[PDB]
């Protein structure tokens, strides 16, 4: 029913897609081994802070 | 601290016990006299009898509509501490289940049923 009028150029398309934009992923190193750890988490290696209870099999 | 605290306090201040009278009982129609007055400070130990209905509980509380068949149905609701009160004596029985707002009474009562409880 309300199909715009034309498209204020890629120009506009961008204006939008643009404010949009894609940021990046938070990370520091394993409180245990190394690599990237996002705040509270463990993983397929170290996997802990008090009992890996995880990784290797 | 906070609320609980401070407030608890101020009220304790004014109401103190609503006048230690802690005779609630669910049922019991019973009778009292509130200062309720007007016209030349005719504060009258007015006493109404009423079949015990409900209540509000905390600082401010209220001995609820106790319905009274006057010759039409008149239910009386009254604040508890509410310095307003003087005599407050029970007569009836603190019985019956399902708890208050048992207006069953005021509603379809029928003297008989009434007694039926």
């Amino acid at each position: 029913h309300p199909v715009p009028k034309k498209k204020t150029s890629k120009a506009r398309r961008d204006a939008r897609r643009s404010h949009h934009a894609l940021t990046p992923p938070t990370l520091v190193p394993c409180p245990e081994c190394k690599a990237m750890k996002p705040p509270h988490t463990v993983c397929p290696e170290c996997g802990y802070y008090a009992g890996r209870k995880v990784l290797e099999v | 601290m906070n609320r609980g605290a401070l407030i608890k306090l101020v009220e304790s201040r004014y109401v103190r016990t609503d006048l230690p009278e802690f005779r609630p009982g669910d049922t019991v129609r019973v009778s009292y006299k509130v200062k309720e007055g007007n016209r030349t400070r005719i504060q009258d130990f007015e006493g109404i009898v009423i079949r015990i209905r409900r209540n509000g509980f905390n600082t401010t509380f209220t001995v609820r509509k106790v319905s009274y068949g006057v010759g039409v149905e008149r239910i009386f609701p009254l604040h508890s501490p509410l310095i307003q009160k003087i005599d407050i004596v029970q007569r009836g029985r603190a019985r019956r289940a399902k708890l208050y707002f048992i207006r069953n009474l005021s509603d379809r009562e029928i003297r008989r049923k009434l007694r039926a409880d």
């Binding site: 509270h40 988490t41 463990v42 993983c43 397929p44 996997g47 209870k53 | -």
Partner: protein, 117 residues
Amino acid sequence: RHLKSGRKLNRHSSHRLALYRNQAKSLLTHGRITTTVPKAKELRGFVDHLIHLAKRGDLHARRLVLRDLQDVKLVRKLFDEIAPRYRDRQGGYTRVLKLAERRRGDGAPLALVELVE
């Protein structure tokens, strides 16, 4: 209308209680289990109170949570199997913790949560 809100959950109260339980149960089975963010969070609150009666330790209590999980194996299993193991701390017998990844198709962030030994 809405804002100041307590006990916060999803799906539908029946569905929920359903889960809470099913899960509480499966964990009881394995000490530690894997699901999604609050799945854990709240499941904590719950399986949580359960262990609470687990501890309660008595014919009655028993009768109750059983009321909820339905099935001896575990019934006793918990109530005596570990309920002791814990009977002595101040609750929080739950350890809810954020894994390494997010289930596929969506990236649903998950974790493992268990009886906190």
